[PDB]
């Protein structure tokens, strides 16, 4: 099984999935290795390879730090890369159904990991299942992350910024150039990714160089307009200058800085990445997308406002408990072996952790806004609230506002809300339907009866895979005609969305609209407070109210002690 | 709405404008406090 490409013939391997066969080509090179002088530059076109490359094993994963917070715990370790780290990492993997399709729709997977981590070789990204079940071709590639992907000195072609994004774009070009040899249809191309994959695809809707290489787009829990997604031009440059300082590369001009930085070991960069930002969050992106003038010719909200983007159909959705993953990575009191009941003061300290630079009135107002209890005292109130706070602030409403604004220009958008908690989740119950733990369902793992999932999870995964495949093929995420819930378009008026769980899928409207309304239409105006006052009358009131109630305490029993 | 008026709005009034009315209120608190010497001289 050998396929001739423009660069040469490539050999793959057959895998047996559900009684059928998929042909896998793992670790196909798509660019020149970014070593030496090519380190930090834009990607260079791959010229030619030597004889037939045996694409029968996963390649090295690209250099990244590893999550080691829970040694031996499957919940965290299943996302860490399971092969060697290296700078020579621009490779892709392709899974094709057997027998060969003649004009198949292609799904392109873009891993996430907050632009700092991730790899395409995770078990949860094995594309053999989707290829077996929906007879489509799936391709995924490794792309540079961190400073290596996004060190920015814009205008300088030695390190212009957004290199990882330009890697993605060149990979798309490679797909356009080569997919026909795999039996693919270059006019039916669908991109999908999560948390940073979705941000990237959404940026390809804005990037003129990306304007003609794909058809549709699926965005799982993410978009560029999230506050952590894109760094301003001069904050990026400042961070670059600071990394240079940390590494002994502060120089007169830019090219001397890069000359010394091209000689540093990847590990030195990795160990220095964490100090370029004075007060970071668990979602802080030290080096990420910016307005480079090439990929982003302007601030994304402005480009978005003017309708200058690819007019196509989109599929967008989120998980029920997006925010739960981050509290156990820094906030005091939380633990995966605890029930994590916290107090008001612990809550407030968590607020200070996730919102370091926000004014005091901002904290008071998020606190006030999130404590309108349905039922009290109810001990789990504050814990869920803080998780609910981070997710609301970071994810759902910007994603919805993006959908709203995209749909205002006339294209069909479809939104889902995944609400099922996996039966194999190793994390405690209180963390619910966690961030990133829908992907295994996206990839079809519960269809495999040997995997200890429930029948209901198989049924669910079949239904989402069917609707997804229909969306890919037709732009409409229907399942069947008759006895199937229709997925209506998301319109800015009704704002209908689809609930996703094993009991019953149904249509609801304006998910948590009042909270997200707070974050988009009130919260921006709170950083405009800017009033640093003498604080002495404020601290005086602070002592004064305790003076009041400590004064109250006296005559409670002064009258009795008589 | 009442949750807003009793539990948020007062702290919003806690910033705009700062003048000697706080010192007026401390004068009121000193007048609230100076009686407690006779409560200190209850039996003692």
């Amino acid at each position: 099984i050998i396929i001739a490409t423009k660069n040469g013939k490539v050999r793959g391997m057959n895998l047996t999935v559900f009684g059928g066969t998929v042909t896998a080509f793992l670790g196909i090179p798509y660019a020149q290795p970014p070593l030496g002088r090519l380190r930090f530059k834009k990607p260079q076109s791959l010229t030619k390879w030597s004889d037939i490359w045996n694409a029968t094993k996963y390649a090295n994963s690209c250099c990244q730090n590893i999550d080691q917070s829970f040694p031996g715990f499957h919940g965290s370790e299943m996302w860490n890369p399971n092969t060697d780290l290296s700078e020579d990492c621009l490779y892709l993997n392709v899974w094709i159904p057997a027998p060969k399709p003649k004009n198949a729709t292609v799904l392109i997977w873009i891993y996430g990991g907050g632009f700092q981590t991730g790899t395409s070789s995770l078990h949860v990204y094995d594309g053999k299942f989707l290829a077996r079940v929906e007879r489509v071709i799936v391709v995924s590639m490794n792309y540079r992350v961190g400073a290596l992907g996004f060190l920015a000195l814009p205008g300088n072609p030695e390190a212009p910024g957004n290199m990882g994004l330009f890697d993605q774009q060149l990979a798309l070009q490679w797909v356009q150039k080569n997919i026909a040899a795999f039996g693919g249809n270059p006019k039916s191309v669908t991109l999908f990714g999560e948390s940073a994959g979705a941000a990237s695809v959404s940026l390809h809707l804005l990037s003129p160089g990306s304007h003609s290489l794909f058809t549709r787009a699926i965005l799982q829990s993410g978009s560029f307009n999230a506050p952590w997604a894109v760094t301003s031009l001069y904050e990026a440059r400042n961070r670059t200058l600071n990394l240079a300082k940390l590494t002994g590369c502060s120089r007169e001009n830019e090219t001397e800085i890069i000359k010394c930085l091209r000689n540093k070991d990847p590990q030195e960069i990795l160990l220095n990445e964490a100090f370029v930002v004075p007060y970071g969050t668990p979602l802080s992106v030290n080096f990420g997308p910016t307005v480079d003038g090439d990929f982003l010719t302007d601030m994304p909200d402005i480009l978005l406002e003017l309708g200058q983007f690819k007019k196509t159909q989109i599929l967008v959705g989120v998980n029920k408990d997006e925010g739960t993953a981050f509290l156990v990575y820094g906030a005091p009191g939380f633990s995966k072996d605890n029930n994590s009941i916290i107090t008001r003061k612990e809550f407030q300290e968590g607020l200070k952790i996730f919102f370091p630079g926000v004014s005091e009135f901002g904290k008071e107002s998020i606190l006030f806004h999130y404590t309108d209890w349905v039922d009290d005292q109810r001990p789990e109130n504050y814990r869920e609230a803080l998780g609910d706070v981070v997710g609301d602030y970071n994810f759902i409403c910007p994603a919805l506002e993006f959908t709203k604004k995209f749909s205002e220009w006339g294209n069909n958008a479809f939104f889902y809300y995944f609400e099922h908690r996996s039966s194999k989740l190793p994390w405690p119950e209180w963390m619910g339907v966690m961030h990133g733990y829908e992907i295994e369902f996206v990839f079809g793992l519960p269809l495999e009866r040997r995997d200890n999932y429930t029948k209901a999870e198989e049924i669910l995964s079949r239904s989402i895979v069917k609707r997804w495949a229909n969306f890919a093929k037709y732009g409409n995420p229907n399942e069947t005609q008759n006895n199937s819930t229709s997925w209506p378009v998301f319109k800015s008026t009704e704002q209908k969305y689809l609930t996703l769980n094993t009991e019953s899928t149904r249509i609801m409207t304006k998910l948590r609209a009042q909270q997200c309304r707070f974050w988009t239409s009130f919260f921006p105006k709170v950083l405009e407070m800017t009033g640093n006052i003498d604080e002495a009358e404020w601290e005086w009131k602070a002592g004064f109210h305790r003076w009041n109630n400590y004064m109250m305490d006296w005559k409670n029993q002064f009258n009795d002690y008589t | 709405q009442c949750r807003f008026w009793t539990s948020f709005f007062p702290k919003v009034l806690e910033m705009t404008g700062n003048i000697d009315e706080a010192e007026w209120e401390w004068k009121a608190g000193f007048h609230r406090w100076n009686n407690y010497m006779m409560d200190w001289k209850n039996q003692f």
Binding site: W554 | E23, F30
Partner: peptide
């Protein structure tokens, strides 16, 4: 007991 005392203000 006899109660905690008041705190005075800082004026500017």
């Amino acid at each position: 007991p006899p109660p905690p005392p008041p705190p005075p203000p800082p004026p500017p």
